[PDB]
Amino acid sequence: CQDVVQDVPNVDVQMLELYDRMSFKDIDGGVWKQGWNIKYDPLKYNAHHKLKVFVVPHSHNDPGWIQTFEEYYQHDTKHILSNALRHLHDNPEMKFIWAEISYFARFYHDLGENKKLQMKSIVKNGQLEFVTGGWVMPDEANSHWRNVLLQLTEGQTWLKQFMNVTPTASWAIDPFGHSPTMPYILQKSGFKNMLIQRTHYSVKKELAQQRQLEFLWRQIWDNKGDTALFTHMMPFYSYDIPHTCGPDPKVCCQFDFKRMGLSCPWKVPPRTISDQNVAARSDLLVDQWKKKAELYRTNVLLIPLGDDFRFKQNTEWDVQRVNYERLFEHINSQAHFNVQAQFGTLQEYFDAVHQAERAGQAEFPTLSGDFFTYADRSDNYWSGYYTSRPYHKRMDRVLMHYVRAAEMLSAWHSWDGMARIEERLEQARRELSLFQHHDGITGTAKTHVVVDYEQRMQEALKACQMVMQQSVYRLLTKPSIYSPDFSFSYFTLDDSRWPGSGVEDSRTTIILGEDILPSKHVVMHNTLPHWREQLVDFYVSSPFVSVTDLANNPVEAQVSPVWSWHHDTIHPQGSTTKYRIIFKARVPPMGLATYVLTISDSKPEHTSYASNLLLRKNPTSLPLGQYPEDVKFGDPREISLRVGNGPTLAFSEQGLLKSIQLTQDSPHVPVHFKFLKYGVRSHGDRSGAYLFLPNGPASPVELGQPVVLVTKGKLESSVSVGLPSVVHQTIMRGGAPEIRNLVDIGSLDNTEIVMRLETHIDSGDIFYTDLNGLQFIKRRRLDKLPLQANYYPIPSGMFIEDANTRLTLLTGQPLGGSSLASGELEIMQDRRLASDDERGLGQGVLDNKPVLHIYRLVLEKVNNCVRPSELHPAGYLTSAAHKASQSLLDPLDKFIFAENEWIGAQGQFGGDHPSAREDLDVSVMRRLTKSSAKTQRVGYVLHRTNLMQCGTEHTQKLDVCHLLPNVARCERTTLTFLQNLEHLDGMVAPEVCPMETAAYVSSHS
Ligand SMILES: [Zn+2]
């Protein structure tokens, strides 16, 4: 296994290094506004050195943007694919690429067997070529790598099953910036090449000047270069026809034959090609092709031909095809050009380029880094969509977990198809996969489409719940008794974090009474492959509740009131009728643990009760029903809480973190939480769904006299405050604290609420942010770039550090963030925007809703951690910060038994499961076969992260091949499970390197 910490890789282009020595001057370049006047020596070409031109027709289909998936399908896509089928069949030289398998599967299943067989033949003879073959073309900023893999697997599994094809070339023309997470996943899913488009105009220029637009893209830690994937970056402003033929859109636009209610912004129409004009038109077009070709190293040239929802009408197919045939006919027949031009596919382009490389014509440069933050022109940076519609950004992370848990829980057995497990999981994977779309998780869709994404994720959440509860009941009910009704709710799920009480008071109360119902079974699930002890909580009808395991062993517990926040100013109210019972669940690896909540007359031996202090001016008292410890009152003051041997936090009199003492004999290190506002420019460019165009630095939010609630217990204490827009909360359980913001931006038009941390950590201009929750990349704040250019995606976490200290903020949701000054972290909470940012969405963001954002805050000493070289472009979390991220993304699942009595009940599942090293995760467990298959197969994805070593154990080799019994074989596979890469003679899974991801499939007899 490579070391990923001391060996800095040697690459031709390192984006962080490149960014430092880039001027980013926005020179007007000419006809190519963001580049220069391209010159070629025309004696470059002759009969032995021809230009080979691949014109590749395409149709960019959004699975939701201005219209819903189903709207666009009925209005546009089903016509595009009907016409593709007809026209390609009738025209053997005509070609077409297709990316979005969600739309293709919708179309294909509605065809007759004849059409279906017509479709297969035009895919078989390579006329219709699938590119990437993901369910969607996903967002690359906000998406978790798990969901990128999920949507890829969903698309390519469909393609294998129904087309017997597996694409090896990716097409990513529309995501708003590009992540190295894509080549990472693609290179481990069999891919050989990938195409990208949406990169900063200064980056297109810098690279075009060195002919570094095609590059071997490796990961930022990869010394050897086994992660390398061949990447073509398109050189111009857009993927449309005016921006794909060559450097002068005025010319290129005249070769968009559909534009003869569509016209050319540059006011020169396309003209029908004739014998009259063909020589003149071919000269114009080949001169464009030869200019574009100067930018690349081979004599092979990629010319995309398409745009959004193109190739819809039968006549658009004719007019594009026939005019380009005449051109090719003239051009290929005329030696003075030294061009061979034809319709081709993306794979044909890449094959030809590698034949040129193999034949010694070009050797390609190596690149590491990312392509964030994207700017299409001047100072219009696309950092807004890192935060837009943050409710659904949070919902993505919640549904991410429920799909993993539902797939894992149900994987342990084969189900009779009567149960409809397969159908639920398929619906759930697909709704999650569709939301990965670059107008889904981005929050760049119209209000009604966002509503559709939300209703789809809501259905999906409910399908997961039904699979999870049926699974738990089977796993923990004596087989001698197990006799399931597949349509019955044996458990309801309890989730204290989605949507969050405050977003919707809809957690069930467990009603106990010594006559009516004295005890209740609950079950915790732990999807992680190691032992976990995590405080869980339930709503209960009495405060006199005791916890036991099923062996009646007592478990220590704390009871807190249920608190709610209300508004004239903003104050808490206590329930007189329900309480929180809190206790430490201990759950096996990928396992279940049963506990029992029992009522008594009075304070039970093993249940403590939290105090409640309402730091408010001018008080009026609050009853809490039978809650034994009466709420205390007082005036605003500073407070200091500790829980367990964990940190001691100090707080202002507004209930905002002021400082953290780690250990008992260590200093009170300053750490100020603070809420600010960014607004919108009155003059010039307006912020929207996509763009972050702030009117100068953010300014403080007036807090007034905020009512500060303090709850203090043995197992959990918290400091909550009612701020304008935000109920801010610091929860303590004996380690890194948890931050919760109920964000209600309400009606504050043209406002972005940010949460900043101010420290004395000597970070300088350095901060780290994660990419797709997979890897942490080094950022340098660049004063030469405006504010919005120093904003980066925060899909999982950000951190600053100096010689001695590091502070890491982990997120439960993807959000925008920066370190705009030394020792600071900031992360945007929500944004409301009256104005459109003129990228075609035709609305602002005025559909905000309450969201509960969740964080963990890890202050740490790193002076005794082996930190990577100062030249290394990557950072790595500690164990503490990694486990803190796991507690946000994949917490324990809580189940409440629905019925009075549970005959069969067992207290544990997975006690015998191996407890793998802290840096290893079973990302995916998924059964691949239905019951009516003689060999059961189960797929596992293993990710091993890399944790900073600071010297601290005792675990046990996990081998996923033996997890289920009667293993007849297992294979190392592609991450989609679709290809075998290594027959494993042992039927043992070999161990996995730091930052590596590997898939295995185990077969059972
Ligand atoms: Zn798009």
User: What phi, psi does 883 have (nearest 5°)?
Assistant: -60, -35
Q: Is 872 annotated as a binding residue?
A: no
| Contacts (Cβ under 8 Å, ≥6 apart) of 421 | 410, 415, 467, 470
For strands 366-368 and 214-217, give the pairing: parallel
Residue 114: other Cβ atoms inside 10 A:
8
Method: X-ray
Closest CA to 401 of 892, 912, 844, 974: 892
Contact predicate 650/719, CB 8 Å: no
Domain ranges of the chain: 1-378, 379-489, 490-610+891-912, 611-890, 913-1005
Dihedral of alpha carbons 650, 654, 657, 658, sign: negative
Contact predicate 612/561, CB 8 Å: yes
Question: In CATH, which superfamily holds the domain spanning 611-890?
Answer: Golgi alpha-mannosidase II; domain 4 (2.70.98.30)
- The Cα–Cα gap between 940 and 882 comes to 21
How close is the Cα of 574 to the center of ligand 1, in Å?
47
What type of residue sits at position 552? N
DSSP letter, residue 156: H
Token digits of residue 502 = 């405050």
Contact predicate 170/191, CB 8 Å: yes
How close is the Cα of 80 to the center of ligand 1, in Å?
16
Q: Is the peptide bond before 157 cis (omega within 30 degrees of 0)?
A: no
Q: Is 268 helix (H, G, I), strand (E, B) or coil?
A: coil
Closest CA to 578 of 622, 625, 546: 625
DSSP letter, residue 541: S
Contact predicate 462/396, CB 8 Å: no
CATH architecture observed for domain 379-489: Up-down Bundle (1.20)
How close is the Cα of 506 to the center of ligand 1, in Å?
36
Q: Is 606 annotated as a binding residue?
A: no
Contact predicate 998/942, CB 8 Å: yes
Q: Is 665 annotated as a binding residue?
A: no
What is 436-450 written as a DSSP string? TBTTTTT--S-HHHH
How close is the Cα of 308 to the center of ligand 1, in Å?
8
Residue 538 is inside which H or E element, if any?
strand 532-540
Q: Is 746 helix (H, G, I), strand (E, B) or coil?
A: coil
Residue 653 is inside which H or E element, if any?
none
- The Cα–Cα gap between 941 and 996 comes to 11
Residue 49 is inside which H or E element, if any?
none
Residue 194: other Cβ atoms inside 10 A:
25
Resolution for this experimental structure (Å): 2.2
- The Cα–Cα gap between 261 and 353 comes to 38
User: What phi, psi does 876 have (nearest 5°)?
Assistant: -135, 145
Closest CA to 796 of 873, 875, 894: 875
For the domain spanning 1-378, the CATH number is 3.20.110.10
Write the burial class of residue 534 (CB in 10 Å: 0-12 exposed, 13-18 middle, 19+ buried): middle
Contact predicate 898/491, CB 8 Å: yes
If you search the block for the tokens 């702030």, which residue do you land on?
A: 694
What is each CA distance from 121 to 101, 106, 321, 382, 539, in whole angstroms?
18, 19, 20, 42, 59
What type of residue sits at position 505? D
Token digits of residue 825 = 């972290």
For the domain spanning 490-610+891-912, the CATH number is 2.60.40.1180
Residue 31: other Cβ atoms inside 10 A:
18
Common-topology check for domains 490-610+891-912 and 913-1005: yes
For strands 557-567 and 519-526, give the pairing: unpaired
What amino acid positions are annotated as catalytic residues?
174
How close is the Cα of 439 to the center of ligand 1, in Å?
7
Residue 489: other Cβ atoms inside 10 A:
14
Counting DSSP H helices and E strands in the chain, the numbers are 16, 50
Dihedral of alpha carbons 833, 835, 838, 841, sign: positive
What is each CA distance from 253 to 316, 318, 573, in whole angstroms?
15, 18, 64
Q: Is 889 helix (H, G, I), strand (E, B) or coil?
A: helix
Contact predicate 538/892, CB 8 Å: no
- The Cα–Cα gap between 256 and 260 comes to 8
Q: How open is the CA angle 412-418-421, to the nearest 5 degrees?
A: 40
Closest CA to 856 of 797, 817, 810, 796: 810
Token digits of residue 938 = 């189960």
How close is the Cα of 117 to the center of ligand 1, in Å?
30
Locate all alpha helices (DSSP H) within 134-221, ordered by sequence.
145-163, 181-187, 201-209
Residue 380: other Cβ atoms inside 10 A:
20
Kindly indicate whether the domain formed by 913-1005 is annotated with CATH number 1.10.510.10: no
- The Cα–Cα gap between 411 and 470 comes to 12
Q: Is 62 annotated as a binding residue?
A: yes
